[PDB]
Every structure is written in C-alpha cells, then in structure tokens.
Design a protein around this ligand. Structure first.
Ligand SMILES: Nc1ncnc2c1ncn2[C@@H]1O[C@H](COP(=O)(O)OP(=O)(O)OP(=O)(O)O)[C@@H](O)[C@H]1O
Ligand SMILES: Nc1ncnc2c1ncn2[C@@H]1O[C@H](COP(=O)(O)OP(=O)(O)OP(=O)(O)O)[C@@H](O)[C@H]1O
Lengths: 515, 523
C-alpha cells in the first residue's frame, strides 16, 4: 500500500510520446480535486494488479498541476473502430471469430475480476497489438470520468452507445453494470457483423438525438438494431438480439455468451498461437495485394500525364522523345507549305456581339479539323483566322509532299462553300488559299511546353504569295507547279507574271481542280 | 509401386498462375510446382526406387515436399509444394523490402539448420544449392529447391555459356575438377552456403566485386584458373562484422582440408550470430510482423507519390489559358465572352532576324530560339501581364485581360517595356559573341474583346481593331527603341513619372498621320 510504485509524479518522463523509455499513450483528465482517497487507492491498486493475455496493462499516472492524465501501453495498430468499419482493408471470417473470441476472453476476466465491468467498454475504445492480440482500454478505475455533464447532444449519443436498460433518464453508477457490459459486447458484435460505423440498423436514417430519445422513451415493440441475415449462420444474430433484450433476465450471462461463442468457433478447434500466426500472414498477403493494385494505379496515372504532356508534337517526335530518345535539328530538302486566311474578316467581326463572334470562330475549327485530319498534313500554328499546313515535315515522303498539300485545298474550298454562319445565314464566307514548295529547316523548340517551329526562307515567300491572292481561288507558285505537271491529273491555269510583291516579275498559277 | 507417380491425366491444370514477383515493379491439396524433364522416357531401376524411398521418408519442417512424379513419357513433372512469397534471392532483389539485421541472422541460422539436416541424411549434399533455390514459406519456413530427385538431373552437355552463367554458384574445387559430382560433396555444399551467406550479408548482387565488374563467364574462368590470391569477393565495409568475416574466410577455403565441419560452423554461428537468440518460435511471428510493418510503410509512401503525380497531371491539363480562367473552368463554371473598355497590347519582334538565321546551322538556329525563350520567360513573370501566343520570333502580350484592373493595365505593360529593353542587351549569341540582338517594341491601348475559344485544346483569343492597330503601329518602329501611341500617351502623362519624348506625324496605312512619341525612361 505504501509502495507508491504506480505514480511517476511527472519527475522523469520523456518529452502520445515516450515515457520512461517505453512509448506509452496517455489520455488527459479534467479534474482538480483529486488529492487522495483510501477507496480510490484500493481501486487503483486493483487496476494495477491485473494482467491477462487479452487484457492491456497500465503504465503510469500523473495527478499534478502540470499534468492530470493516465498513460497505458500504446496500441501500435489502429483502433477496432476503424478496422471494423473496413473498406480500407478486408478481413476473413475466421479473423472475425478470432477477434470476437479474444474480446470475449478479455471480457470474461474483466467482469469476473477485481470489480464489475467498467461499463464504458465502447467498440471505439479497444485496439489490437502488433501481433494482433486484441486489447481494450475499457477501465475507468472510478476516476476516469472527467466531470462534464453539460457537454451536449454529441456526448449524449456517444453515451447512448451504452445499454438501453440502464439509460432510462436516470443517473447510472460510474462503475457500470453487467447488463451494460453485455450490451456493449452485443453492440461490438453487431458492428463487426455489419461493418458500418456504430449502432446502425437497416432503417432509413437516424439522427443521434432522435434515435437516443426514441430508445430512452421506449417503443411498444422492442427497439433493436436488427442486422441483415446471411446464409453462413443466424444463431449469432439471435444471441445478439437476446442480449439486447429490454428484460435483463432475458439477457444471457457472460458464461452463456462464452459457451455460444465456443460453439460457434467449434468448427476451427484451434487453441494454439498458430491461428494468430496464420491470420497475421493472410492479413499481410491482403496488404500486399492492395499495394500491387495501388502501384498499378500510380503507373497508369504517370502514363496519362506523359501522354498529356506532348499533345502539340506531330505524333512522330512525340513517340520518339517519350521512348528515352533524343531529337536533333533537321533540314529537309523539299516541303510544302499551305496558307489559309479569312478574307475581309476584320469587318464581319466588327458588327457582332462578343457572344455572337466567339461561336463562329469556334464553329469553323470543328469544320476544318474534320477535313484537315483525313489527309497526311500537319497544323503547326493557328492564331485566329490564319492557318499553317506543312507536308512531310515529321517523316520525309519524297515527291508525295507536293501532292497531298494540293488536294487538301480543293477538298477544303468546296467544304467551306456550304458552311452556315449563324450570325447571317444568307452570307458566304470568303477564304484565300496559297500553296508553295521549297527547302526548310525544323527542330524541337521549347522546354516548358514543347512547340515545333519551322525556320526557312520559303515561309516568307509563301506568306507574300498568300497575301497577294484573290478570294475563292488557290494560288500556287512555279515550284509547286513543276511537281504538279510532273505528276499530272490536275487542271492548273496560267495567271500572269505581272502581279508580284517583294520581287520582280514572278509567274504564279491558279488551281482549278483535279480530274 | 512407390505411390509417388502422379498421373498427367488426373489433374494437369490448376491455379494457372499468379505473379511470384508480387512487389514493386496444384493437385487437390494445394498449389504445386510446375516443372518438367527432357529425358522423354522412364527407366526407373533399383537406384530410382531407392531415391523415391528416400524422398518419401524425408519429412522435415524445412525441406520441401513433392507430391509425386509424372506418368506421361512426353511431358514430365515434379509436383513439389510451392512455398509462397518468392525466393531469398527474390526477397533481397527488391531494395524496397528492407532486411532486418536480427531477422536476416535468423534466416541465415534457419538455412544453416536446414543444411545440417540435409547433410546428416543419406543425401550428402544437394549439389544444386543456390541463393535462387531457397524459397521462404507462408510463415517464412525456408526450404532448399531441387534438393532431391536423384533419379533425374540436368546433366546433359548443353549451353556452355548458359552453364558458365547459371552454374556460377559452384565451388572452385568443383569447377577446376573436370568430372562434376551430381551428388556433390559436403565441402562443395559448404562453399555454396558460404557464398549464399556472403550474398545475404551485403545488399549488392552476386560476388559483389565493386571492381572491374567483368562478365560472369570471365570471372568464373579466372576463378577456375586461379592464382596465389584466389579470385574471391570481400565481405563488407562494416566495422562491426569481424566475426562474420572470420567465419566467411574459412568459408572461402580452397581445399577440402580447410573445409570446416559445417555443423561446427553452425555451432560457431549460434555462438556469434545468435546474440542472446530468442524463443523456439516467437522469432518467426515477430519477424513476419516487422516485414508487414515495412510493407505498410512502403505503400503509404507510394500513395503519397501517387497523389503528387495526380496533382502534377491536373496542373499539366490546363496551362495555356489564364490562371484565373483555368481555375474558373476547373471549378465547374462556364466562362462567357466579355468586352473590356480599355486594354494594353504589346508587340515585340527581332529586327533583321530573317538575315541572321539565314546563314546559320540548323543546330545553331535551334539553340538560338530556345535560349531566347528561356531569356524572356524569366523577365515576363516579374510583372502583371499575360502571354496568349508566341509564334516564332514574335511576341504578343496583353495587359488586364483576365481580371479588370482599371487604370493600372496601362501602367504595367509599359514598366515591362523598360526591363525587357535592358535585359536584351546583355544577351549572348552562341555562334557570334560580338553582336547585340536588336529588338522592336510597340505598345497600344484599345477596347479589345476576348474569349476562351477552342475545343479539346482551348486557347484565349482577343478580337477587335486593337490588334490591327497595334500591328500597324509596331510595323513602323525602330530597333532598340520603344514606340508609344496617343491613347497610351494620354494615360502615361496622366499617371506621371515617365519621361516621354515627341516623335512626329509619320503616316500609317490607316487613318493617316497621327501623333506619336517615344518612351525614354521612368523617373
Ligand atoms: N492501442 C491503444 N492503446 C491505448 N490507447 C489507445 C489505443 N488506440 C487508441 N487509443 C486512445 O484511446 C482513446 C480512445 O478514446 P477516448 O478514451 O479518449 O474516448 P472516450 O471519452 O472514452 O469515449 P468513447 O469510448 O465513447 O469513444 C484515444 O485517446 C486514442 O488515442
Ligand atoms: N517453390 C518455389 N519457390 C520459388 N521458385 C520456385 C519454386 N518452385 C519452382 N520455382 C522456380 O524456380 C525459379 C528459381 O530457381 P531456378 O531458376 O534455379 O529454377 P528451378 O526450377 O528451381 O531449378 P534449377 O536450379 O534446376 O533451374 C523461380 O523463378 C521459379 O520459376
């Protein structure tokens, strides 16, 4: 009695955190009148002088102005609350019976021990050890009740977890009752069977205060959280319902519950640690399976991000730079450049609302992208109305580069003559189209966002030719006309070497169609 | 009959496949091993009967068990019990899985006990013991693979290079000797166990040379040839492994005389490796729990990495659009077309760029644009302005477009016209270091109207006469000089603090001759 070996007096505690080397967990208490009491001393001595395989152990207590708390061995894994809820990780049926048997074995010694059951043995105040040896906090020692009766409805519900029979709008003893322990065990079993929060029945929905008041008032039919049945067994549910019966006599005793649990677990009939070892091994396997799933998801996400990162590349450098390769600058001997511009667009957009002028430039992108993708061309840049077509830039096509860039304008000049402008349905848009061929030089440019620029003297000549071009006609240069005549099958027309800008007299031809 | 002839017809397929490397990237009783043989015939003599009897009588907690032999002459099978979670070599393969020193020592003592039990029996040595032929079980009960079935073996001369690659675990004495013992001697098994212990002690690969790192064939040939110092690896760099080194030095013994009596070696290890040891079987549970905790830590870190990658992909999805518009589009709301009373438009162009790039190598022309992009993208982030498009060597920047800023937009697109006209003079050209890149700048103010156009690839586009006016104004500028407009000039004069200078009444392709001014500096 005079040993005083239960108190550390806050003198030597490691700065829950560790304490005297051991990493115990401490729960605080809100009280100031706890000085000394012989009965409380005997209760604390009884609480310290107990140990069991399924029961936890008390470590230390502090009752000084610096700290009013009790510290016990810290459970490494999570509490039973989170695990039983599940949907994070799964569990086996034999695992369920192992946990239930451990809880029952602990409760049998707890209730029939130094004193009656602590009463506050909620399903959210018990956890498992490192080797999954279920323990419970579940002792108050007549001093853990930090006085605060005026908390509110949340405390009302978390109490309403308690047995219905004791909770009858009256003050129960702080120690508790055997019926409270029986109902706590029944509630824990129901939570394990249903795996959904605490005290959930089929129903539709239940507020904490509403359900608590309905239970306390007393319905003519017995208010019981009826759990959904299953094909494996139903005697466990019947025992759970009988334990929760309003009549205390109908509630079976701890010995009866233990006998029923043994009968249910008689299928296993294993009493050695081997069951625990197997359960731990299968739990580890389940964890590994979850790990595999999540790493697969991470790989998929990384792949998606990589695919997103290179949307502007011309589908060739994109597949090369992705596969750890490197792309150097290149110069191509002959490429075809095509320009498309809206003629007189600076006036149509003048007399139009911004909402009436943003649905037109967006309705022409969806009309040209359906035809600019059929052929083997590429759109390098697009700023407003002007376009950009380069043929053969990614992979050389030889002499074909001058054939696909000329059939694209003929299929786009007729596809724009039936385009409906919602701002004015009785009007036809005018577009100028120019084509040129010549050597070019290109390469991958950009670090934050990879673009693809074409750098050559032919671009300026093509721009000059396209600028000086009549509407509703395709203007081609002599270099393109050479390849056109070499291939054949298209009707080109001589226009005249008179109208030329930036040079002297240069012959440019008109594209009229291909048979 | 030996009651160990499993029929090919009875149960050939069961539990098709699950990837054994379940880490970072069967017949009516349990899962069984899937192997075969190229003999294509059965000629079991009395020796094969004795081997089958020895296999049937051999029942130990460590050594694996075999269901039976095959029946069909074409397809052979050795239905051995499959111990899960891969092999010890596989266990050390993934560096993500972390061996615990005590845990590794317990594993080594377990394999030592298995080796002693195997040696004491009729089979003097397995003859094929290796790091990859020792798999842990569901409770990490170690076994030895191919430690039996003396009737058949892969003794057919074939794949000499693959022999030098996959039979590297053999002892130097066995390798030097032309005739190899299929049922090897105890000394060879001891040397194989020593090599396995050396591999387990370190974290690197086989033979852990950290030297020339030559091919396995060359190393094996050198070891077979030998010298005064035998070709052999060191132990480790740990200063607290003196006993491990002392045991391993006797383990690399070259002659059978120096070969230790492996039972005595295991006793010495229990003296040294078993530091206070543990209980009969609690150690297994503790070491399994430690491994489970390790896996939990690994998966938590992996989930954190996945969340970071998801955030990165979300950022990468929308970046061309303005930050405010991108947030308003990712939230769920729809951006509508808006008209603004007064905005600032800025044009920048390299003067004579078509001539400097004419006489240049393609690499020397692609290394001059990327460097300029990295030289302007750092000074444009120190102001309050937006970039909407960048086509080649021309820049176009808007001010105040995303969020209305009142009379501040005209006071922000001009302050950046002075920090960019003084940061383009210290630029460096790779292929000509004695030249300065001339730039042309134009600024204008006007009532633009902009929207978020585009499907599946949206971009922010501004429309109105302001763009055309700005282009016309900037098409008649001068290099190394900032040219302003009357609309911007009024706001600049109203704000104060900028020393403007009159320019003249140069005509333009438009309304005609209008007032113009230069921006000299900011007081
Ligand atoms: N394995 C464990 N060992 C010791 N303490 C633990 C363990 N797991 C959780 N705890 C702690 O036990 C406490 C459980 O809740 P707490 O005792 O504070 O609530 P309570 O007021 O008794 O109410 P209720 O049981 O209704 O939730 C928490 O402080 C939690 O951190
Ligand atoms: N129980 C088992 N545990 C681990 N690996 C096994 C097992 N049974 C068969 N294997 C196979 O053995 C491989 C590793 O050993 P190894 O490559 O040496 O082949 P082996 O079939 O065991 O025999 P051998 O030494 O003749 O090649 C594994 O990749 C797997 O395919």
């Amino acid at each position: 009695l005079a040993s005083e070996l239960w108190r550390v007096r806050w003198e030597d505690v490691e700065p829950t955190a560790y304490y005297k080397g051991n990493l115990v967990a401490v729960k605080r208490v809100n009280r100031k009148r706890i000085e000394l009491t012989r009965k409380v001393l005997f209760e604390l001595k009884h609480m310290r002088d107990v140990q069991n395989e399924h029961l936890t152990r008390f470590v230390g207590a502090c009752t000084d102005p610096p700290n009013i708390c009790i510290l016990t061995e810290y459970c490494p894994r999570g509490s039973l609350q989170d695990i039983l809820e599940n949907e994070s990780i799964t569990l086996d049926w034999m695992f369920r019976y192992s946990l239930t048997n451990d809880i029952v074995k602990g409760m049998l010694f707890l209730h029939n021990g130094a004193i009656c059951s602590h009463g506050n043995l909620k399903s959210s105040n018990c956890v498992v050890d490192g080797r999954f040896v279920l323990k419970i906090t579940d002792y108050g020692l007549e001093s853990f009740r930090d006085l605060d009766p005026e908390q509110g409805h949340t405390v009302y519900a978390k109490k309403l977890w308690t047995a219905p029979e004791l909770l009858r709008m009256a003050s129960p003893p702080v120690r508790g009752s055997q019926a409270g322990d029986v109902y706590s065990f029944g509630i824990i079993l129901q939570e394990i069977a249903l795996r959904s929060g605490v005290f959930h029945v089929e129903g539709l929905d239940l507020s904490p205060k509403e359900i608590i008041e309905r239970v306390t008032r007393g319905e003519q039919p017995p208010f019981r959280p009826s759990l959904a049945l299953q094909s494996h067994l139903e005697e466990l549910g019947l025992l759970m319902q009988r334990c929760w019966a309003e009549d205390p006599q109908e509630r079976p005793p701890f010995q009866q519950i233990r006998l029923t649990l043994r009968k249910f677990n008689r299928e296993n009939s294993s009493n050695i640690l081997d069951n625990l070892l197997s359960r731990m091994e299968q739990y580890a396997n389940n964890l590994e399976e979850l790990v595999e799933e999540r790493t697969q998801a991470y790989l998929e996400e990384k792949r998606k991000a990589e695919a997103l990162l290179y949307q502007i590349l011309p589908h060739s450098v994109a597949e090369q730079l992705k596969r750890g390769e490197t792309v150097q600058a290149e110069a191509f001997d002959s490429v075809t450049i095509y320009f498309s511009d809206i003629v007189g667009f600076t006036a149509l957009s003048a007399e139009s609302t911004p909402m009436q002028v943003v649905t037109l430039l967006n309705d022409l992108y969806t009309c040209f992208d359906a035809v600019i993708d059929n052929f083997d061309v590429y759109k390098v840049e697009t700023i407003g109305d002007a376009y950009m077509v380069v043929s053969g830039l990614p992979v050389r096509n030889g002499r074909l580069h001058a054939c696909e860039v000329a059939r694209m304008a003929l299929a786009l000049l007729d596809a724009v003559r039936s385009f409906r402008i919602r701002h004015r349905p009785q009007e036809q848009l005018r577009l100028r189209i120019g084509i040129h061929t010549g050597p070019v030089c290109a390469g991958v440019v950009g670090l934050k966002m990879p673009r693809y620029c074409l750098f050559g003297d032919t671009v300026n000549t093509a721009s000059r030719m396209e600028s000086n071009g009549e509407a509703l006609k395709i203007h081609l240069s002599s270099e393109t006309k050479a390849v056109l005549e070499e291939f054949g099958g298209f009707e080109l027309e001589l226009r005249g070497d008179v109208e030329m800008k930036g040079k002297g007299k240069v012959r440019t031809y008109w594209l009229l169609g291909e048979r």
